[PDB]
Amino acid sequence: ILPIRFQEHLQLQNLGINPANIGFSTLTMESDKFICIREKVGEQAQVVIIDMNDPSNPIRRPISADSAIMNPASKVIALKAGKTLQIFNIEMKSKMKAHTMTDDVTFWKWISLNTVALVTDNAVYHWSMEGESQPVKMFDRHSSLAGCQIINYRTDAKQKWLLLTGISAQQNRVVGAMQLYSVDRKVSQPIEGHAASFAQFKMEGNAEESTLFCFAVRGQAGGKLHIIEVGTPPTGNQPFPKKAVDVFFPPEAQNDFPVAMQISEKHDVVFLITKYGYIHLYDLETGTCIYMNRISGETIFVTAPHEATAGIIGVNRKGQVLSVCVEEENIIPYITNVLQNPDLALRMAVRNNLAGAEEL
Amino acid sequence: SDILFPA
Amino acid sequence: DILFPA
């Protein structure tokens, strides 16, 4: 029995998607509701939008955009061509917002239902869709990310901790460079890391949720996963004790590294996916590694939270849309009987109201 | 000049 | 080895 449920939702090539457009710079998946692909049909650029609730009926539209990102919840698309940004409500056939940057945007992403983050060579901006807001600079980029391909930007729930992630080659490996910025302290911290997420976690004995920062890295010391509280604990809270655990890479995966992370706050579990298709699960509280295995023979380049199961959904270069979530009926006996960790099993059972620890 | 057009 | 999906 497996502590996870692993599903294939879609094979994009069955919708006529050219596998040449299945990659990081042409396919976006900002949430589990839509996938968006830029393709050139003949001389014409277009965008194909796949509604994950109705995948046999993709919308195709001509565009002149070098990047397209759908809103996480609504058919509202952000498109850019160089310095020109335009936000369109597709169903209303209207341009909601336009802005012209004074720098190219090398990465952008919806960080919430209504804010787009924009990364230039020099800085990171947030652009709210409310009212007449223009982009606001959040911080300047740290020099440790200079030259990196930017691959992710995330925030905590309150948008007080901001995390920029780049990668580059140093000594013939892929090295991750992160910039963690505190909005309240206005201080950046450079961190070596490949994939990360924030999460809200309420410790036993605390009245308030802690904000945790979880990041995985393959460094010189090998693979490591860290879980720490960021910021000053809310008044009355105990601090969350820092965790650090190994991230295993097998000897035949010598150039693999972590590419994606999502955290289930329903199960307090960390899903970590590596570039070459390995899935790891860790307990958010303790960092204990629950499971590893390989789920994709092709590289995975984009993930989102899989809302329904509180898992992780993603796309590989073949165009499979795959998800992993916790198998709620199996996870506790797995931990008890295969990992032989009754302490963790029992803890997770009562912590997240899962069945199976009636017998340990 | 819209960068998204009708179908 | 590898998991295969439902």
Author numbering:
A (entry chain A): 4 to 363
B (entry chain E): 1 to 7
C (entry chain G): 2 to 7
Wording from the paper:
Clathrin mediates vesicular transport between post‐Golgi membranes in eukaryotes and is targeted to specific membranes by interactions with clathrin adaptor proteins. A total of 3 consensus clathrin‐binding peptide sequences have been identified and structural studies show that each binds distinct sites on the clathrin heavy chain N‐terminal domain (NTD). We have solved high‐resolution structures of NTD bound to peptide motifs from the cellular clathrin adaptors β2 adaptin and amphiphysin plus a putative viral clathrin adaptor, hepatitis D virus large antigen (HDAg‐L). Surprisingly, with each peptide we observe simultaneous peptide binding at multiple sites on NTD and viral peptides binding to the same sites as cellular peptides.
The viral peptides (HDAg‐L1pep and HDAg‐L2pep) bound at a similar site on NTD. However, in both cases only 2 consecutive hydrophobic side chains could be observed in the hydrophobic pocket (“IL” and “LL” in the cases of HDAg‐L1pep and HDAg‐L2pep, respectively). Interestingly, for both HDAg‐L1pep and HDAg‐L2pep the residues bound at the clathrin box do not match predictions based on alignments to the CBM consensus sequence, 18: in HDAg‐L1pep residues “ILFPA” occupy the positions corresponding to the LΦxΦ[DE], whereas in HDAg‐L2pep the residues “LLES”, including a C‐terminal serine residue that is non‐native and was added to the peptide to aid solubility, occupy the positions equivalent to the first 4 residues of the LΦxΦ[DE] consensus. There was not strong evidence for the HDAg‐L1pep peptide bound at the arrestin box. In addition to binding at the clathrin and arrestin boxes, in 3 of the NTD:peptide co‐crystal structures solved (Amph4T1pep, HDAg‐L1pep and HDAg‐L2pep) a bound peptide could be observed lying across the interface between blades 6 and 7 of the NTD β‐propeller. In the co‐structure with Amph4T1pep a phenylalanine side chain projects deep into this pocket while in the HDAg‐L1pep and HDAg‐L2pep structures the side chains of a leucine residue and proline residue, respectively, bind less deeply. In addition, in the co‐structures with HDAg‐L1pep and Amph4T1pep the backbone carbonyl oxygen of F9 forms a hydrogen bond with a backbone amide nitrogen of the bound peptide, and backbone atom(s) of E11 form hydrogen bond(s) with the bound peptide (1 bond in the case of HDAg‐L1pep, 2 in the case of Amph4T1pep). Despite the similar molecular interactions made between the Royle box and the bound peptides, we note that the direction of the peptide chain differs between HDAg‐L1pep and Amph4T1pep/HDAg‐L2pep. Previous cell‐based studies showed that mutation of HDAg‐L1 L199 to alanine severely reduced VLP production and clathrin co‐immunoprecipitation. This is consistent with our structure, as L199 forms extensive hydrophobic contacts at both the Royle and clathrin boxes.
